[PDB]
Structure 1
Amino acid sequence: MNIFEMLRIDEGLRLKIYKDTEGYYTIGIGHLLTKSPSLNAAKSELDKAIGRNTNGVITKDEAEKLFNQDVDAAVRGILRNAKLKPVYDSLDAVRRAALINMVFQMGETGVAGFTNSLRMLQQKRWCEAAVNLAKSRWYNQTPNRAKRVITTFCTGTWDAYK
């Protein structure tokens, strides 16, 4: 287990081009290809990115690859964020992962909105934090994910993704 499978599960992996919600070409784990409106452009970018003639279709490794980037980006977002940073730093691999998970789903800003939680997390009150997120729209909106993420903050294991 790792963040890639973690996210493979939470969000999902499409291995072929797709127009996201707002019409944009994406692939793998929400890896956006182009904002432009040309498939050829999406394709080109992919093919560039992947280092071969994908033809719009990729493998999971490739996806990983692509993913490993989005990840790097997210972290940089976190660390640039005066609220998220301290937390990120206090965290252990797994917990960071759980944070990246959230970040990945609601944006650095969103995640940023949970004051207490972050605090508590910062202080190592995994459990309370968890308890605390349980009581949020989030928890109520995508309960299946939230639960896992939540438990993750509490347990600090991948126990929930097995």
Structure 2
Amino acid sequence: MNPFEMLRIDEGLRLKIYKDTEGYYTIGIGHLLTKSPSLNAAKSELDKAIGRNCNGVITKDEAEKLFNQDVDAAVRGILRNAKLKPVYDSLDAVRRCALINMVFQMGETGVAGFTNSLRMLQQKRWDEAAVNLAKSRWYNQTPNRAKRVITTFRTGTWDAYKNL
């Protein structure tokens, strides 16, 4: 595994402009393009973003790159986050990876709301923490994806996604 494949599985990949749950134009792995109703504008923002005559559709790699700039942006925020910063620093590279997964999935705000759970991770209390996170509304909401993320944390390996 690697982080793109992680999200590939979790968020899914989209190579053609789409609308999300909130109506927003998006593309690749959750890459929101714009908030205005206009396809016209997304199209344009994309072309731009990607750098050529895409026309509402990109490549796989073209997407990875977008995906790369977004992980980058997420990390950056994490480090500017005071609740998130310390946790993130405590984490070995791969679990850092799970934390981006979550953030990606629920925003920085939502993530930092798992008080006890973060403390647990920070402390490097890998099992209890596993246990704990299985209690949340997160786990009921999106079970599969929650389970995978949790194993990542438990173990600090790509066990849950590698055969996938």
TM-score by length of 1: 0.95
**In structure 2, how many angstroms separate the alpha carbons of the residues matched to 1:33 and 1:103?**
18
Q: Which runs of 5+ in 2 are unaligned?
A: none
Number of residues paired by the alignment? 162
Partner secondary structure for residue 160 of structure 1:
helix
- CA offset at residue 125 of structure 1? 1.0
Q: Deviations over 1:101-145 (max 9, x none)?
A: 111111111110111111111111112111110111111211101
Partner secondary structure for residue 157 of structure 1:
coil
Out of 20-29 and 151-160, give the one that drifted further.
Answer: 20-29
Partner secondary structure for residue 18 of structure 1:
strand
Q: Deviations over 1:49-75 (max 9, x none)?
A: 112111111111111111112212211
Q: Deviations over 1:10-35 (max 9, x none)?
A: 11011100112222211011101111
**In structure 1, how many angstroms separate the alpha carbons of the residues matched to 2:29 and 2:52?**
19
**In structure 1, how many angstroms separate the alpha carbons of the residues matched to 2:5 and 2:87?**
23
**In structure 1, how many angstroms separate the alpha carbons of the residues matched to 2:108 and 2:74?**
8
TM-score by length of 2: 0.94
The percent of aligned pairs where both chains have the same amino acid is 97
Partner secondary structure for residue 56 of structure 1:
coil
- 1:107 aligned residue: 107
**In structure 1, how many angstroms separate the alpha carbons of the residues matched to 2:10 and 2:120?**
24
CA RMSD of aligned residues (A): 1.1
Partner secondary structure for residue 26 of structure 1:
strand
**In structure 1, how many angstroms separate the alpha carbons of the residues matched to 2:91 and 2:127?**
14
